[PDB]
């Protein structure tokens, strides 16, 4: 087939990521997204069951992919000689968890509560099947704007989910663990839970707590909004120095602060105008 099955549209973004275009499959005009990925710029390869050298995100993305679409899923993807073309899913209206903080500051509880329960359910899913994301945070989420659904975004830095330590990381340093900055050691979960911490905070007070590894290690939280006590409770349990200290996903389900959730067609309509 090659490219004569997508039309290729404005490029939306490029970074550490590669470059995404929007595009539009011509078979039945359903949104796409196009991300190119240089081969000389990967640096976590694997392989596909079939036996074939693709990049590890590819890998990740295949096993995340199918019926919770909590996950922008991977619908396809070429091979070029310097380069990997990944066709992804696309919404639209759509806007990532960063610019929507940006343009509106920190979110009121109730809408950050809809959205933080849905990263939750997004992660377990992953971890579900045997993948770890590694990068979580407001620029690796999307917005569906109508309905209000949020979706996980960019593997690359992701890794096959484990028990045993890991050693190697190449997601966001303000988003990292403790145990990372001083032993560069961690485990799959807590250090999830540990960027969840950082996601939650930045969601009700408008941005991040840490920005120095120095303030990373200290532990202390302060808070510039006003946020609730179970709110701010479980922020401060998430970002529990000892990894042990800190909650499971179900914990965090279970939490106080995290009941009465709004279903994300509510949350659109009452917050997103929609």
């Not at 796409?32 to 990925?37: G, Q």
């Not at 096993?63 to 310097?82: A, H, N, Q, T």
């Not at 028990?163 to 990372?180: C, K, N």
Request: some cysteine; glycine content about 8%.
């Amino acid at each position: 087939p090659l490219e004569s099955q997508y039309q290729v549209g404005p490029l939306l973004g490029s970074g550490g990521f590669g470059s995404v275009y929007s595009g539009i499959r011509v078979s039945d005009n359903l949104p796409v997204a196009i991300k190119h990925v240089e081969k000389d710029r990967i640096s976590d390869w694997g392989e596909l069951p079939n036996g074939t050298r693709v990049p590890m995100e590819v890998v990740l993305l295949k096993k995340v992919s199918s019926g919770f679409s909590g996950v922008i899923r991977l619908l396809d993807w070429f091979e070029r000689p310097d380069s990997f073309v990944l066709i992804l899913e696309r919404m639209e209206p759509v806007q990532d968890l960063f610019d929507f903080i940006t343009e509106r500051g920190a979110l009121q509880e109730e809408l950050a509560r809809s959205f933080f329960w849905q990263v939750l359910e997004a992660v377990r899913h992953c971890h579900n099947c045997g993948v770890l994301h590694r990068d979580i945070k407001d620029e690796n989420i999307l917005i569906d704007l109508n309905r209000g659904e949020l979706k996980l975004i960019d593997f690359g830095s992701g890794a096959l989910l484990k028990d045993t330590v890991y050693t190697d990381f190449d997601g966001t340093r303000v988003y990292s663990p403790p145990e990372w900055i001083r032993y560069h050691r961690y485990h799959g979960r807590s250090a999830a839970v540990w960027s969840l911490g950082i996601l939650l905070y930045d969601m009700v007070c408008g941005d991040i707590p840490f920005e120095h590894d120095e303030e990373i290690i200290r532990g202390q939280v302060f808070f510039r909004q006003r946020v609730s006590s179970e709110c701010q409770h479980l922020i401060r349990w998430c970002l529990a120095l000892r990894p042990s200290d800190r909650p499971t996903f179900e914990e965090i389900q279970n939490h106080p602060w995290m009941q009465d959730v709004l279903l994300p067609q509510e949350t659109a309509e009452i917050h997103l105008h929609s």
